[PDB]
Ligand binder design. Sequence first.
Ligand code: HEM
Ligand SMILES: CN[C@@H](Cc1ccccc1)C(=O)N[C@H](CO)Cc1c[nH]c2ccccc12
Length: 395
Amino acid sequence: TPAPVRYPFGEAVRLDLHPTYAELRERRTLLRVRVPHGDDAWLVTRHEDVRTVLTDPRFSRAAAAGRDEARLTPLVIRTSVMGVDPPDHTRLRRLVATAFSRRGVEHLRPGITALVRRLTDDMVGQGPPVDLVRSFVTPLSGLVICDLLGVPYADRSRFRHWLEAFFSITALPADEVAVRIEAMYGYIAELVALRRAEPTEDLLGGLVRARDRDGSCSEEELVDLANVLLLAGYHTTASQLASSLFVLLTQPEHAELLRSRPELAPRAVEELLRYVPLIAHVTFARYATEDVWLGGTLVRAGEAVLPAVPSANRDAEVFDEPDRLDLTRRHNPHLAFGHGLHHCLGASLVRVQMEVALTMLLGRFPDLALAAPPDEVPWTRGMQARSPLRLPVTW
Ligand code: HEM
Ligand SMILES: CN[C@@H](Cc1ccccc1)C(=O)N[C@H](CO)Cc1c[nH]c2ccccc12
């Protein structure tokens, strides 16, 4: 194999993609790389190629649990349904699929709408400037994931310390990663226990009933599944909505487009998912289980592949002018939610939260503008997802 290049190519800066990704797409080759932790891997960068590795059966995600997973984090993270192949993946997803369907999530829109109203009610009285990350983006995603799952949002003062340890690359040392992670796995266990004595009318309550009277999941599958849903809803969604708000407030000709044309919103939400590079670098690695050829490379059974999803979302062979934001694109086959088997489970819930919050922010602050130069806005350094630390605005 070729000499392995360091990966990452550098810290992810704001929302800029490193130039090597585009050259790799043009080269039509995988790149053998050397990551901060785990085995070496092949970096995958073309929309066509990232689709193959995300979902082809010959590329396994279970096979990486019996390995020191190529990865960017110090510790291997438990990814629940995201770390298993079928039939374990089937068995487990079916337990949460109906709650996260488009029809299932449509019922949450009246209350998501009303929260966005109560949150925007408060910027009005508070007055500029407002930190949109603190006063809006985090209360919205944080209160909508906790109310669906059953986690007390009023418990955020203890478990949002622990959520950062799952997303750290260089922000925390590995000993502080290991300890916050077990703090979280013991807070989840607290909640599972409080519901065998006191059944709840929430997603966690229904998962505990599902392990107890059906045995449809082991107890660590139970606690992992619930650990991962609050991971994704409380922080991954806030990152994307905080970064989409950066893209509109710094390219303010697109905020003016969508504000004058709110019917664009479902298209505007999709393109903001294609165009924002939410994943700092790569998604979860897969290991070949037999020999697959792609990207001018015979990947042998047992080798890793790292899918660089943000790069696939700029593939000129799929997206006309992929580096220009076009909030009005009609067909958007982006991979910002994954592809095939592991396609993002809260897809519909991210969309609804994003349609509502963008429509009302733009509708209700028609001259909303950043209260700093775009480059004076601070960004998450060392983290697995990209996000602005604060987002001061005025109107
Ligand atoms: C803007 C916010 C989000 C983004 C960008 C996002 C992105 C993704 C992506 C790209 C994948 C596929 C990963 C891969 O194959 O490597 C994925 C899988 C998944 N996502 Fe998220 N997600 C978001 C919010 C959420 C929310 C709110 C939930 C649940 C409450 C969620 C739960 C999941 C689950 C459970 C999986 C694994 C599904 C399976 O393995 O069948 N995500 N997500
Ligand atoms: C290489 N995973 C990185 C990058 C990433 C990948 C996908 C989405 C967002 C960000 C990460 O931050 N992963 C975070 C932090 O561990 C956890 C996570 C994100 N999506 C998940 C789905 C199921 C279980 C866990 C997760």
